[PDB]
Design a protein around this ligand. Sequence first.
Ligand SMILES: [Mg+2]
Ligand SMILES: [Mg+2]
Ligand SMILES: [Mg+2]
Ligand SMILES: [Mg+2]
Ligand SMILES: [Mg+2]
Ligand SMILES: [Mg+2]
Ligand SMILES: [Mg+2]
Ligand SMILES: [Mg+2]
Ligand SMILES: [Mg+2]
Ligand SMILES: [Mg+2]
Ligand SMILES: [Mg+2]
Ligand SMILES: [Mg+2]
Lengths: 61, 145, 70, 143, 135, 79, 206, 67
Amino acid sequence: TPVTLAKVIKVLGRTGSRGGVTQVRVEFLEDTSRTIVRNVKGPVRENDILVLMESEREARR
Amino acid sequence: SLVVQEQGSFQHILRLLNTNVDGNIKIVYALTTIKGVGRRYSNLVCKKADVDLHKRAGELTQEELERIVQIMQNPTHYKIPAWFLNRQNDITDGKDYHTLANNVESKLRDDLERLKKIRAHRGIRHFWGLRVRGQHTKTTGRRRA
Amino acid sequence: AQHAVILDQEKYDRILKEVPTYRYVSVSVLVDRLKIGGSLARIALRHLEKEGIIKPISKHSKQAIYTRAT
Amino acid sequence: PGVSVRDVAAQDFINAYASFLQRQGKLEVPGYVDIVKTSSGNEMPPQDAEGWFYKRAASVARHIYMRKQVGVGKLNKLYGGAKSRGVRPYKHIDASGSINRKVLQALEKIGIVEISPKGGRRISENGQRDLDRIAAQTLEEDE
Amino acid sequence: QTFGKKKSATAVAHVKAGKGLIKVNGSPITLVEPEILRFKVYEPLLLVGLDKFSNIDIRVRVTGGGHVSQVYAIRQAIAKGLVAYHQKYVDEQSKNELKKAFTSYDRTLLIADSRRPEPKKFGGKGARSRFQKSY
Amino acid sequence: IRITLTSTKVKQLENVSSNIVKNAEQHNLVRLPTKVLKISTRKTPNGEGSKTWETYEMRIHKRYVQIVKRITQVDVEVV
Amino acid sequence: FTPVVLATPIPEEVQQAQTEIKLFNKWSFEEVEVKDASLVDYVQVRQPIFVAHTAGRYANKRFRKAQCPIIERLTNSLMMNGRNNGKKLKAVRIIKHTLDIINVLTDQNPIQVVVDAITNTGPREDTTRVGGGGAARRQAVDVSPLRRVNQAIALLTIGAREAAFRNIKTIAETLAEELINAAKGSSTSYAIKKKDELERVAKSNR
Amino acid sequence: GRVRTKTVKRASKALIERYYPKLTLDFQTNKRLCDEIATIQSKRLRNKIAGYTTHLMKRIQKGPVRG
RNA sequence: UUAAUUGCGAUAACGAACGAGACCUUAACCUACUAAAUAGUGGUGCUAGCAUUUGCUGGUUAUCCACUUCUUAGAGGGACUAUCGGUUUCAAGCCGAUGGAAGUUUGAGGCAAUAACAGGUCUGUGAUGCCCUUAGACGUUCUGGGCCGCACGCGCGCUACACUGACGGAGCCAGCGAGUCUAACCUUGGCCGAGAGGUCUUGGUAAUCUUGUGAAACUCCGUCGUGCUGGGGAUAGAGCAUUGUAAUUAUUGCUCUUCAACGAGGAAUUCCUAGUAAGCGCAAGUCAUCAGCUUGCGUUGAUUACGUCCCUGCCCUUUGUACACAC
Ligand SMILES: [Mg+2]
Ligand SMILES: [Mg+2]
Ligand SMILES: [Mg+2]
Ligand SMILES: [Mg+2]
Ligand SMILES: [Mg+2]
Ligand SMILES: [Mg+2]
Ligand SMILES: [Mg+2]
Ligand SMILES: [Mg+2]
Ligand SMILES: [Mg+2]
Ligand SMILES: [Mg+2]
Ligand SMILES: [Mg+2]
Ligand SMILES: [Mg+2]
């Protein structure tokens, strides 16, 4: 069960040709120290903790 | 109600007026298995022949339902009115029947033949396969044969 | 299966083998368990409601819910 | 304890009490029952047919007590649901007139309905009496 | 003299020293029977104030709307009823003790649900929706 | 006395209502719902184009011895 | 427990539930934890409600249906496939039926074995359509704290909807026989079979 | 949605030039000031001049506004 | 920057006209005044019922006083994004919040410019140019048929494949409306009829009467049991009614009987963001009779987005052109 936590620090914006995805900066909490930009599907705002299936190697566009 | 068991006196397969009827089926509808026996007219005779409707078809005796065959082919003499009858006032003899089993198609045939040979509209219109009831015929009713 | 509409007893005192390790019982449980069809399963849920192990939790027409000898 | 019908629920009172008029047998039923549906705007004759004149007679008196004066027509509007007009839109169709009139009759043959001096049907002089009577029958063993 | 409203259902009550009988329509509240919405009507009195409503003026009658605008209307009457005899009557800090507990759960009891239904424009069976198109 | 008065415009409808509660003190002595009549037809004279509908409206507002015959001198009527 | 009465006999059962400790009418709306830290703030137990019909404006502004009592939330995704539209009263009777239809299979508060059945019904990752077109790539993107909720609802209602259809069982009996498995490691539940289906080339396309 | 047009902005500053004698940072005071000296037609018309005149006032303290 | 050629600003432009907006309409509140058997409530006179310190429920067609909260419409009040923060880039504004009946121009409409189209209408005009016809008439009337005609393709819809259902009792809740004297409109209540419907009264020119329009979905209680079944009601037979000089090619309604396809619809494709979608019925137009249509009105009341320019496509610049009957 390779999972990890991540709450969204800020919302970089949207991408996707139809406009239904958001770029987010993120971190895992205790000894926070992470920052990586994942793209996310349903609506998301600040401090929304969310899942992750590999702790790094995010994307863009 | 509550549970009984009963002995082996139930049946599937039971032929009554040339038509076998399923027995595992509850009663008043296993009667509609006969042409001419609808639901209004099946619901009534079997109460004005004094039977309990909660029972499936598997019970009963011949004169418990000869109670119904002489009811159904001679109902004018059994307190059921004339507006329940698929043939009332006739046109051959003026007396009111109830066409049943085979009798429906046959005295339907007479109804069509009486018009088809008189060259009435409905007569040769029936003889063509077209709608006798005045409905539109361009937009509707196509795939068929 | 083709299912059944009367109350002999082949697996129908499995109609009395009718509680342990399957608590909830109602019409749907009766028909499924390699068993009856479900219109005599309504007087029967009325029959063991009369005096049986099944006790009513549910007060409504559309579904009855009955449990074990809890 | 000072019981009117308004303090007993409708269904269990209208129904379990309608069995009282069976218990007595002061009937005057029409006898054309076993051939009726209560409306053109429905399809099957009433399921039971062993009763339901009591339930109907209960029902009308409950509304007649609960308000001032009733009429034969308004009975048809009330019970009459929607005719399944087949393949066309459903509509409100009124109910059987003969059915409802013959219950507004057979109820002042018992002393529960009056014939309002204004026209219509008043709850009778003694109707306001025996209706509240069945309340404490039902209530004082239903708490 | 309190209001009650959901859409076109309106419910009425009154303010003076009272009875104990809490009357719905004429058939008192005990059973109203849109069967399970009874807890909708029961709801107000239960945060605080469970009794001494034998000095209480609660007759309520409902007209208009339907089987659920009336249930929402009557609670709009009853709840505003209590804080009504707490205006220049038994202390007004209790107004701010009920308007406190009612409104801090307010499922449209003190403040009327403003939601009214939209006029339908032509070319459709609706205010917003439209007939089907064919090119 | 009892008068019932009606018109479509409201001003000269209420320039008599006030003008009669002031003859009410002529020797220091003693609103209906508005009816909207709706005609709803098509804008187009023939049959063409977008199927466009158009409601019109009439607004009808109604209200309610020697001095009697010299008070009646908008739709005036009294009984 | 403060039993008390007035001129209208108040049924005793009502007075000993709410004013004693402000419950829901039968089921203890009281403390029930969420077994997924990302639904912290995305679930509305406490404040309790006695009936699942608090008709309120949870739509005209955006995120508010987060604050809707998360049990009235699901009583809404049931009244559809077209015929059942409207008809909340038909829906809320299915839920209070299903609660003790659940409760007759091991006790302790079915108000949780529903939420215990959505945290493992939320798809962690998901895959959607690139600009592309025909030759379009399927890049994975992780899933929202609120989408994981919204969609595990309609996923759960749907599985019941199409299994109640034409089968002898009841609609309350279906989603009861479906909510329970999603409590953990279902492997035999419709909505779980779809969340686990939906995580497809999921941690690979990232 | 909420952009006031030159009908208000011209009229709203048409006052502040002739009546900075008086005029306040509170809306409802100017509300009932307006119709005394102006000839606005509708209430919504006046309430929007007032809402902006007050807005120019709530900011007039800290630096004069162009024009 | 705004929904906005809406504003801030920037400026060889300045100052101005229409369009946007303002406006008018309707939906929200209002314990503020004026007020009321054509609207209600409370009280009281008189009376039914229930248990009895007098309590519940009614009736009370002036049975007298009082009230104006529900209801009607006059005069008006009210929101102006007020206030507080976050934000801006000085600004115009945008975002959050508290407050509030109300904070997407508050919700929804009416109005709507310049230039155009060979768009549609001479089948609305006793509007009309020219042409054709004018007595064996293309005028007009009368009789009778057709516009409905059925190997087939398509557009708007109605009804359904069911167990969140059908049916039977039962509960019982709206709003917008229309309605009769050079006359027979809307119809309560009494009987008769299983029904459709029949009949002798009756009220209303209508906040009064029909009408609380006791609508339908819906709600409580039962029956049915998975398969074309009691789902579905097409087709057709027989009989009874209603409209109308006239029902045949069934006008429509009713009764019994007959009981088809349809087991959730391929490629395609419409509509929709809140009391909205969809479900449900009702009135009005039509109308002698006939709604599966339309114009509205309320009842039940969600899911899903509060985003993009991918497709379809509008607007504003800049750009290229061999286009100008304009890709
Ligand atoms: Mg009914
Ligand atoms: Mg009905
Ligand atoms: Mg094409
Ligand atoms: Mg234009
Ligand atoms: Mg042309
Ligand atoms: Mg011409
Ligand atoms: Mg034609
Ligand atoms: Mg079309
Ligand atoms: Mg059927
Ligand atoms: Mg039903
Ligand atoms: Mg399109
Ligand atoms: Mg038409």
